[PDB]
Assembly symmetry: C2
Homo-oligomer: 437 residues x 2
């Protein structure tokens, strides 16, 4: 585990995980960019999440909605009226600053040409309920998963990835029948909690907090936050709320014909009825929604934070090692040529990297950087699990003349630091064993 | 292949590929949303692209920059100026600027203005030094990236084509001033070749080499790959050659580095975006080759191409999306013959999981009524195989034999041929046909 927030910010910048967006012109404070190593880890996390909640389940439909949100969507969801914070200057009278990113479509800044950069992914889901329903012919006890970008017009962007203006989320909207709501809520909480550990976070660092009714927003019958023990303090990773029929409620047509339980605004615009019908009979009703929502960047940081570890070495000095779960490492194997000038060597290495990539266990990388020592260092810092290295013996140029050593390479374990030399054909099975899911 | 643009728009909406963003409130014309089936295909394409240009190569670094762009980036890249033009049509004296913009935090002050990037490339350019430092890369190398971009279109025409929000797959290949012309043709063959591997016919592809009149000033050459869509040729990808303009326009110590393209005096940049050590110690700004594709366009191209209407032996027709298997939103559909039977449904579900485990792509358990409707629904969304489970599969054959236990019928999308095989063979059957 890592001890300081800056150790991370430093590594992140130093090894190419994260960079201050627009750095060369002073930065656009509050927005960051993901480097070579960052994109990989980030994507690996998003994928593992998608595989788990969509592919592996049989009640989940996927989605990808746009960032440009029509003014109305955000009126009827309440944001226009409440997504704000209390602000002032130096002392003027106090007033709420609505934190949404607004931008005007086309020609003129007229009130009717205003649109928003969605501040959360969920509304995209809600407005498409009927749509999704029609096209898939889904029955109840079902949700819609989605990953995407969101923009919060924060006032003061604090410590790193935490208080940012642009970021990404992984949200699910699980539609449920009014009666069964309380069950599904605890079901999802165990599930998400469980997932995070499988990804590599320790139970000791996870904290399932249940919000007291003072904190619960009006339509939220209950909600639990999963916090992670970061170096600088506990920060929220994911939130599993229970929103009754508020969301579907606020956007649907024929509001008073469908017995809506949460208080909604009169909707004089919606063209479709977002409700479900046929509880064996013919009743229309608005489903209740359970909603797990995680923040991609937070997750990426949690993983780094957890993995980060400093080890003392027998000679006296230390080393930084990202102990990331293998399947999630930005790089799985690094193939390194002992000498940089030799062509039969580089050409072999490259031929080998490809053979390994073909196993389909994750990114294999051909490394041509000078100094076999620097390489090992660079890799432990970015958490890659294995390093295979190629030398003259591997080729067949043994100074003694035998070829008993042709096609064998040394593979160095990231964690144990143990190096063993094995023949290539065994190397495959070795890797399957250790890298498969 | 498909004959009309509306046939597609219709299928896309009908089967859950694409929907009009904000439809229930009148739509936010010009922006669309990707449904269950759409997200899948879209992602499948992005991935195949990433695997190819990053994993399979040894000179590529990946990236993911933010949409919120600082005002300055877009000043020095030229964009800001292309639209600082009072056009008086008498209608009022406007600025017909093509970028969405917005202001950061507290006030609408000029120093607090920001933009929603209109292209992904600038994110790459500004980080050149950064990426360089952290990776210790040598020349003959690029940076790949996928992301969102926003064009403040005035009139959103025909579907996916003239839209305000969309995504791109761009690469910035940094090259030494001398070798530029070579790399340019290299990339063109490569991209061209890729597109066909994805399933597009050579007959429908059109490599247009822009004549000196079209080329923006700093562009020493450029080729557009057009696709023959039902409504006409529309641009899929563009491989330009931008010399040292981009890196040039953003770097510090401009006149110390012999920049060849005309750039603006840059009084703000804090880093020097150049390369040094041509064996010696000379500094210079690399030339850039740039393949840039539009995700949505690609998705449409694939759909357009795959779309086909067939006349069947009984007399009726059918719509079949002939998508390349590895790209299909769904690889296998496991379907139960009767919906009420527990031994059947329970069997089928257990089977779908066994198949998903093969790691060949999404397998889906289908519980929709009517075995006929299912087959139809699937050919329409282009899923390659359909396995079906019945009473024989379980072991309740009305003839009394058990020779047919643990076997299922699998219907080929294309040939429509159905063969009944045992489950264990089924695996090998699928690997054969579905692997990359």
């Amino acid at each position: 585990a890592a001890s300081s927030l800056d150790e991370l910010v430093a590594l992140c910048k130093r090894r190419g995980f994260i960079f201050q967006s627009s750095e060369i012109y002073g930065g656009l404070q509050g927005v960051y960019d993901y480097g070579p190593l960052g994109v990989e880890l980030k994507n690996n996390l998003k994928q593992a999440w998608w595989r788990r909640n969509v592919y592996e389940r049989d009640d989940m439909e996927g989605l990808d909605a746009s960032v440009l949100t029509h003014r109305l969507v955000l009126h009827y969801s309440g944001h226009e009226a409440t997504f704000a914070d209390p602000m002032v200057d130096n002392w003027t009278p106090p007033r709420y600053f609505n934190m949404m990113f607004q931008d005007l479509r086309g020609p003129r800044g007229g009130r009717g040409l205003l649109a928003y950069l969605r501040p959360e992914t969920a509304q995209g889901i809600f407005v498409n309920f009927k749509n999704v329903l029609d096209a898939t012919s889904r029955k109840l006890g079902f949700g819609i998963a989605q990953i995407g970008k969101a923009f919060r017009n924060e006032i003061t962007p604090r410590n790193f990835i935490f208080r940012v203006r642009e970021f990404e989320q992984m949200e699910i909207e699980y539609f449920v029948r009014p009666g069964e709501d309380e069950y599904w809520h605890r079901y999802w909480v165990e599930e998400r909690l469980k997932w995070w550990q499988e990804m590599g976070l320790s139970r000791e660092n996870l904290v399932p907090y249940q919000q007291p009714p003072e904190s619960s927003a009006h339509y939220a019958k209950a909600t639990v936050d999963i916090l992670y023990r970061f170096p600088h303090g506990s920060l929220e990773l994911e939130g599993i709320a229970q929103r009754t029929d508020f969301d579907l409620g606020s956007h649907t047509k024929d509001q008073e014909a469908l017995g809506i339980t949460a208080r909604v605004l009169r909707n004089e615009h919606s063209t479709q009825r977002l409700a479900y019908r046929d509880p064996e009979t013919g009743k229309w009703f608005v489903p209740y929604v359970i909603e797990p929502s995680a923040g991609v960047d937070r997750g990426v940081l949690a993983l780094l934070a957890e993995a980060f570890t400093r080890e003392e070495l027998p000679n006296g000095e230390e080393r930084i090692v990202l102990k990331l779960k293998p399947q999630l490492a930005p790089i799985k194997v690094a193939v390194i040529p002992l000498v940089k000038n030799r062509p039969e060597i580089t050409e072999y290495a490259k031929r080998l990297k490809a053979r390994l990539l073909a196993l389909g266990l994750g990114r294999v990388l051909y490394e041509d950087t000078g100094n076999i020592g620097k390489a090992y260092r660079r890799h432990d810092e970015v958490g890659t699990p294995f390093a295979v290295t190629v030398d003259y013996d591997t080729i067949g140029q043994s100074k003694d003349g035998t070829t008993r050593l042709k096609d064998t390479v040394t593979v160095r374990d990231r964690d144990t630091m143990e190096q063993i030399r094995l023949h290539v054909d065994e190397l495959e099975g070795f890797l399957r064993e250790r890298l498969r899911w």
